[PDB]
């Protein structure tokens, strides 16, 4: 069980709202920013995880059209592939973390302003937008 705090806006946390994944401050209810890292749905090797909502059990962060949303696992390999991430050292500071996609290993979870998206990471600010602190 963990929250993910943004490296560059450190009072904002990854959270779900109307099934979109985004970051926000003063997250209400606070349980929309609580997550469980579980073994990757598409790969149970060390380092691979899926990111399950604590207040919507069975629903996980999943990418589609390069956007991340909170979606119910429908049991498919397609879902699992797009909802599995490798936790790697933080791209902006390696003592934090970044989430690299399993099926698109050059893309990472990043906030784009308040939206959460799955992007290739080029600039310093892109690295900072893709870096999170695990609060657990
Ligand atoms: Ca999103």
Burial grade of 40 (CB within 10 A; 0-12, 13-18, 19 or more): buried
Beta-carbon contacts of 113 under 8 Å, excluding residues fewer than 6 positions away, are none
Is 78 assigned a ligand-binding role in the annotation? no
Is 70 assigned a ligand-binding role in the annotation? no
Beta-carbon contacts of 46 under 8 Å, excluding residues fewer than 6 positions away, are none
Residue 71's beta-bridge partner residues? 60
Q: For residue 64, report the distance from its CA to the centre of ligand 1, in Å.
A: 9
We report the CATH number of the domain holding residue 59 as: 2.80.10.50
Is 119 assigned a ligand-binding role in the annotation? no
41 and 50 Cβ atoms separated by less than 8 Å: yes
Q: For residue 60, report the distance from its CA to the centre of ligand 1, in Å.
A: 12
Number of folded domains in the chain?
A: 1
Host domain of residue 37: 1-136
Name the method of structure determination.
X-ray
Q: For residue 16, report the distance from its CA to the centre of ligand 1, in Å.
A: 8
Q: What distances in angstroms separate CA 72 from CA 63, 128, 134, one per listed residue?
A: 12, 29, 23
Prior bond to 76 cis, omega within 30?
no
Is 21 assigned a ligand-binding role in the annotation? yes
Q: For residue 1, report the distance from its CA to the centre of ligand 1, in Å.
A: 21
Burial grade of 83 (CB within 10 A; 0-12, 13-18, 19 or more): buried
Is 92 assigned a ligand-binding role in the annotation? no
Data resolution in angstroms = 1.8
Alpha-helical (H) ranges within the chain are: 77-81, 124-129
Q: What distances in angstroms separate CA 91 from CA 31, 34, 50, 96, one per listed residue?
A: 27, 22, 19, 8
């Amino acid at each position: 069980k963990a929250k993910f705090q943004s490296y560059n806006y450190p009072n904002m946390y990854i959270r779900h709202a109307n099934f979109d994944a985004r970051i926000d401050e003063n997250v209400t209810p606070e349980m929309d920013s609580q997550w469980e890292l579980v073994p990757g749905l598409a790969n149970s090797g060390d380092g691979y995880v899926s990111i399950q909502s604590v207040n919507y059990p069975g629903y996980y962060l999943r990418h589609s059209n390069y956007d991340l949303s909170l979606e119910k696992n429908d049991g498919t390999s397609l879902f699992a592939e797009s909802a599995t991430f490798k936790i790697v050292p933080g791209l902006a500071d390696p003592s934090y973390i970044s989430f690299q996609s399993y099926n698109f290993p050059t893309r990472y979870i990043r906030h784009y302003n308040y939206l959460l998206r799955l992007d290739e990471i080029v600039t310093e600010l892109d690295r900072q937008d893709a870096t999170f602190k695990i609060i657990s």
